């Protein structure tokens, strides 16, 4: 393609330099990247969304974002707090009669949200595949740790937080998310359940064997990892987390998600979002997103003091997809990286850190 005019955007070279190697090294079929600088969104798109159609990725392409969903679920919970339907210090069994009598009489909504209830596992046991079996699972569950003392990253934990927050608002989770929360965030192309009208924009994910796949159903998947979105909608979510939104209650909810509860190493756990003092070293960002922090129980330490420059981030994956978002309100910068391959978290962090450092100036 020589002889073509090169893109006009001054940020294109910076983003290409970090993203193109990544696509080639991990054989990523497609990636939508969106960056925020000086109030403005920039979109850089790579590759193909669906190898059957050959359609290129755009900033309207829908990707599974896996656990990045947890930031939206946390915002829904924070919205329930702002509306007075629940408090973070409520015992979880206050919001579910079927939980009365269990360990969840003495575990708070906040602890569920922040994976600190006492050792709920990363995933439901594969046998837990119905609502009835889910309820039984929680009632039988034996605490490993005292509430508040250890972070064990957990889909059953924040999934139950999101279930019960929706219940406190007297609406099922998915329609509450789609009809109240997402529209107020300006996310009009974001879904728990992708509707007919939007299916053509939905990428296929690609497994390590290059087979086309999409997310498998699971218990509390909607709450823990069930969002499909575009790079433009997720960057609008970043902007909502910096400059706010018109809905008064949703504004407060967003702010609540930034508040620190405790730290693990250099990472401070908020509601959904995980945060760092900024500027942040690649080493610190890698450690906070490392296998040790994701897969092991770590003791909770004092949260970082509030104020100064802070970076917020969240990783997420499904079998066919890999997502990352990071932003720094105090510098007005942010990045969204949505791919249809689940490629290593360390590579996401390296590229995002490098791009953000150039954007910061
Ligand atoms: P985040 O992206 O860190 O985690 C959510 C993803 O983990 C996988 N996941 C959760 N629970 C299960 C079960 N029961 N079975 C298979 N995979 C699971 C999904 O890839 C989520 O998107």
């Amino acid at each position: 393609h020589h002889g073509e005019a090169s893109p006009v955007d001054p940020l294109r070279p910076v983003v290409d330099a970090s993203i193109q190697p990544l696509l080639k090294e991990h054989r990523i079929p497609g990636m939508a990247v969106a960056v925020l600088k000086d109030g403005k969104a920039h979109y850089f798109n790579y590759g193909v969304a669906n190898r059957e159609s050959g359609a290129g990725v755009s900033e309207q392409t829908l990707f599974e974002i896996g656990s990045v969903s947890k930031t939206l679920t946390a915002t829904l919970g924070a919205y329930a707090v702002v509306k007075g339907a629940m408090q973070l210090d409520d015992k979880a069994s206050r919001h579910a009669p079927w939980l009365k009598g269990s360990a969840f009489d003495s575990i708070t909504m906040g602890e569920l949200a922040t994976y600190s209830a006492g050792g709920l596992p990363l995933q439901f046991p594969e046998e837990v595949d119905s609502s009835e079996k889910m309820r039984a699972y929680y009632r039988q569950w034996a605490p490993v740790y005292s509430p508040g003392s250890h972070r064990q990253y957990s889909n059953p934990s924040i999934g139950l937080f999101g279930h019960l927050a929706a219940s406190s608002l007297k609406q099922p989770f998915a329609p509450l998310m789609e009809q109240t929360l997402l529209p107020g965030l300006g996310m009009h192309h974001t879904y728990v359940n992708v509707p007919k009208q939007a299916m053509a924009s939905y990428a296929y994910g690609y497994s390590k064997e290059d087979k086309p796949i999409r997310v498998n159903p699971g218990m509390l998947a909607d709450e823990a990892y069930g969002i499909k979105t575009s790079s433009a909608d997720l960057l609008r979510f970043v902007k909502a987390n910096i400059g706010g939104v018109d809905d008064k209650a949703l504004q407060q909810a967003i702010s609540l998600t930034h508040q620190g509860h405790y730290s693990v190493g250099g990472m401070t756990q908020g509601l959904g979002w995980e945060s760092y003092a900024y500027p942040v070293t690649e080493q610190t960002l890698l450690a906070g997103n490392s296998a040790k922090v994701i897969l092991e129980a770590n003791p909770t330490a004092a949260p970082r003091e509030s104020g100064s420059q802070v970076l917020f981030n969240k990783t997420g994956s499904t079998n066919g997809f890999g997502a990352y978002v990071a932003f720094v309100p105090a510098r007005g910068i942010g990045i969204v990286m949505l791919a249809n391959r689940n490629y290593p978290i360390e590579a996401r962090i390296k590229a995002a850190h490098a791009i953000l450092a150039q954007l910061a100036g």
Side-chain angles (χ1 to χ4, degrees), residues 2-247 249-304 306-307 309-361:
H2 339 264
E4 292 188 332
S6 293
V8 66
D9 192 326
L11 300 179
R12 164 68 79 161
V14 173
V15 179
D16 280 356
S18 282
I19 298 301
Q20 283 176 335
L22 182 56
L23 306 169
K24 186 168 188 191
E25 185 173 44
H26 299 288
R27 309 196 308 111
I28 301 172
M31 188 182 295
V33 179
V35 298
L36 176 73
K37 188 186 173 181
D38 294 323
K40 174 172 137 42
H42 304 242
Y43 308 108
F44 307 103
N45 301 302
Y46 306 86
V48 294
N50 179 336
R51 289 180 164 146
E52 188 193 312
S53 74
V57 170
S58 73
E59 70 271 21
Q60 327 289 356
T61 299
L62 298 171
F63 294 82
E64 302 165 3
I65 65 177
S67 299
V68 179
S69 307
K70 291 174 172 65
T71 62
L72 291 161
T73 297
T75 303
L76 189 147
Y79 184 83
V81 170
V82 173
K83 298 287 297 184
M86 51 154 296
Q87 298 158 17
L88 293 183
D89 64 355
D90 289 346
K91 307 306 195 310
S93 63
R94 172 172 166 73
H95 298 291
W98 56 271
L99 279 174
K100 294 272 182 176
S102 72
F104 295 93
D105 296 333
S106 301
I107 286 162
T108 66
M109 291 290 286
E111 287 164 344
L112 288 175
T114 63
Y115 325 112
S116 57
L120 281 164
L122 180 64
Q123 300 181 4
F124 286 114
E126 306 234 40
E127 299 87 3
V128 178
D129 61 7
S130 72
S131 287
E132 180 169 281
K133 286 172 187 169
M134 183 195 74
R135 285 185 180 195
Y137 168 80
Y138 286 116
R139 290 190 55 78
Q140 170 263 354
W141 173 76
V144 189
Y145 312 106
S146 67
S149 65
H150 290 73
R151 178 185 192 273
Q152 175 91 64
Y153 182 62
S154 170
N155 293 295
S157 189
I158 192 168
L160 185 60
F161 174 74
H163 208 67
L164 296 180
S167 184
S168 79
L169 284 166
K170 311 300 195 183
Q171 186 174 11
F173 182 89
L176 179 58
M177 177 69 77
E178 289 182 346
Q179 297 159 24
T180 297
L181 208 83
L182 297 169
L185 297 169
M187 297 172 81
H188 300 291
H189 196 49
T190 298
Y191 313 92
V192 178
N193 300 116
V194 182
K196 181 186 179 171
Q197 309 62 36
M199 284 297 293
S201 77
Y202 187 0
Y204 268 94
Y206 291 91
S207 72
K208 302 299 118 59
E209 298 81 33
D210 296 337
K211 299 320 192 73
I213 49 173
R214 285 172 175 157
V215 65
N216 308 130
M219 291 310 305
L220 305 186
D222 290 355
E223 291 91 339
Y225 52 86
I227 297 284
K228 279 63 64 163
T229 191
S230 67
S231 68
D233 261 15
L234 201 53
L235 202 69
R236 274 183 281 276
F237 187 43
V238 168
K239 292 178 61 195
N241 271 263
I242 296 180
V245 295
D246 283 345
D247 184 281
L250 188 50
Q251 183 50 54
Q252 278 177 266
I254 292 167
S255 301
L256 181 50
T257 68
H258 298 179
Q259 191 183 340
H261 293 256
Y262 61 79
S263 64
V264 174
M267 183 273 284
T268 289
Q269 180 68 63
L271 287 200
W273 296 110
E274 298 170 21
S275 69
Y276 300 83
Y278 193 80
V280 64
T281 66
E282 190 193 79
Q283 184 180 60
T284 295
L285 201 53
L286 285 169
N289 290 290
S290 71
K292 178 186 173 65
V293 173
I294 298 166
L295 299 171
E296 300 271 342
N298 291 91
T300 55
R304 183 190 69 255
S306 181
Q309 307 205 336
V310 177
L311 175 148
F312 296 93
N313 82 146
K314 186 74 187 79
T315 62
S317 318
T318 59
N319 290 340
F321 290 83
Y324 185 63
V325 48
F327 61 96
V328 182
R331 305 292 273 274
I333 59 179
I335 185 166
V336 167
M337 293 155 57
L338 311 179
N340 56 0
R341 179 174 178 111
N342 175 10
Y343 69 101
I345 284 176
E346 53 85 27
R348 309 176 201 184
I349 299 314
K350 180 204 268 197
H353 171 265
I355 293 168
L356 289 169
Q358 293 172 77
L359 297 184

